[PDB]
């Protein structure tokens, strides 16, 4: 059972999530319309390719942590 979808503006950037050389994930996240690879761990926590070693509770938390990491930088498509 996947998390709910979301859509908000966080630190000036649009982050979105929705249920759906890299993985199979039942959930998709976007930062300014560019897909961010994210992954769910067995305990329900989430990580992303820009914060891979620091699990956060939800995909929205992963998107926000990616925005914080990016410091305004465009994401490159994976």
């Amino acid at each position: 059972a996947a998390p709910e979808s979301f859509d908000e503006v966080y630190k000036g950037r649009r982050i979105q999530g929705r249920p759906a050389h890299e993985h199979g994930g039942g959930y998709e996240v976007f930062v300014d319309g560019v897909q961010l690879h994210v992954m769910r761990n067995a305990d329900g926590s989430w990580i992303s390719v820009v914060s891979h070693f620091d699990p956060v509770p939800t995909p929205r938390a992963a998107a926000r942590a990616a925005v914080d990491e990016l410091q305004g930088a465009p994401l490159l498509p994976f």
């Binding site: 050389h21 761990n41 390719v49 820009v50 070693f53 699990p55």
Partner: protein
């Protein structure tokens, strides 16, 4: 064939290590190591195939990946070996690791850009090409996203765990491998990635040369665990879906098994074990 504590390297050893790393970058070989690691970071999953991490083969896979890299360094300068970073001992930004004659220091506040050392973007010698965002400069925030590196007491607590790994052989496992990797417990290896910050905290973490020294110390800790637990060995030992069993071969090499990598002394020894 001796891996030394970074803190003990001579000036010539530091110089030759940095030069060899930079030649691998120049020739395009370095970035292919980044890309290999990223492929496995992004594809290994707790409920599906998992080889390079979040799984028992985390340790032999990284041992073989580090041997591939060391062999590449030696193809440039045969005297060079991978040093290791004991982050339980060398735990502040004041450590010589982070001096301008070795890896350079932390990144500036504005954009996390590393401004000194051989790998600073301003040198022209360290483009970040394999990347997940537009920025093409090495970044770090030492101690930014987590206060403290693991302590020696914390490490000792993980070395005390007798079982190598346990079902379900993933990030939810109890046992030594997952506590060393850090998904459960006081957290050793994952927390060091978070403490360095910058590209080390991302899915393209070998972009920072400290990656290799971190993993060389994680690999030493596996060797120290083996000595504490002579009656414990790699598991699982056959017939496990999605997980590399002891005698199964591992991607990407396909020609080596965890069994071929349990004894490091077939390839190198440490200055002190």
């Amino acid at each position: 064939t001796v891996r030394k504590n970074q803190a003990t390297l001579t000036a010539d050893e530091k110089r030759r290590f940095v030069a060899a790393v930079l030649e691998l970058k120049r020739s395009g070989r370095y970035d292919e190591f980044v890309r290999t690691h990223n492929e496995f970071i992004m594809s290994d999953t707790d409920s599906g195939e998992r080889t390079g991490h979040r799984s028992p083969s985390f340790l032999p896979w990284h041992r073989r990946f580090l041997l591939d890299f060391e062999q590449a360094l030696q193809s440039v300068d045969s005297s060079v070996t991978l040093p290791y970073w004991d982050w339980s001992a060398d735990r502040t930004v004041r450590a010589s690791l982070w001096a301008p004659d070795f890896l350079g220091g932390t990144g500036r506040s504005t954009d996390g850009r590393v401004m000194d050392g051989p790998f600073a973007a301003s040198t022209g010698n360290w483009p970040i090409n394999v990347r997940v965002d537009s920025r093409t400069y090495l970044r770090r925030s030492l101690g930014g996203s987590v206060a403290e590196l693991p302590t020696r007491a914390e490490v000792e607590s993980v070395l005390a765990i007798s079982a190598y790994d346990l079902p379900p052989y993933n990030s939810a496992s109890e046992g030594f491998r997952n506590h060393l990797e850090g998904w459960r417990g006081v957290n050793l290896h994952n927390r060091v990635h978070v403490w360095v910050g910058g590209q080390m905290a991302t899915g393209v973490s070998p972009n920072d040369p400290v990656f290799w020294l971190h993993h060389a110390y994680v690999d030493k800790l596996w060797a120290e665990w083996q000595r504490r637990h002579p009656d414990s060995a790699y598991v699982p030992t056959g017939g496990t879906p999605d997980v590399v069993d002891l005698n199964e071969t591992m991607k990407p090499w396909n020609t080596v098994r965890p069994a071929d990598l349990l004894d490091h002394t077939a390839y190198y020894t440490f200055d002190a074990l």
